[PDB]
Design a protein around this ligand. Sequence first.
Ligand SMILES: CCC(CC)(CO)Nc1ncnc2[nH]ccc12
Length: 167
Amino acid sequence: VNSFSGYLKLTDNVYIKNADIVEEAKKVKPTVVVNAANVYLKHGGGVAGALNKATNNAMQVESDDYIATNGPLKVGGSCVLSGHNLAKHCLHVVGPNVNKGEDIQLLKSAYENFNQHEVLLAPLLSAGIFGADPIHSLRVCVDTVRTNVYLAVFDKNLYDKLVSSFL
Ligand SMILES: CCC(CC)(CO)Nc1ncnc2[nH]ccc12
């Protein structure tokens, strides 16, 4: 039993809700919140910009030190950093950005990072400003993640379409 509330159960391990991931994290304080990161950990917009804003830019400060030490992530890769006031940890995961021409096949690799954590609060990878089809992202999530994932979909209209079209 966990404290995630109001989710629709899609499969044995995948759950979904129309919610703002920032407000969900602040309520649940999960062990792991997933950020829709880029390889430079520049949290300017989308989910990343919203999470970073909620940390009063502490996420960005920590991220800049991470990059200065380690260099950029790989597309499809991840790193674990602090969750600041939102969660114990933040798993920064880089899905491909279609608006940069990046290979969509890397979306499966991106979701594989979730399997290193027993329970996660997450967005749909490569959705929103990353330019991929959120329906496809949900399919890859369900077919790749084996640990317990709670998906927050900000747009109410998109959520209803994801639910209604889910096979
Ligand atoms: C902008 C698209 C979407 C769904 C509304 C997923 O790709 N992005 C988010 N999904 C969950 N929580 C969010 N908070 C701020 C943005 C955001």
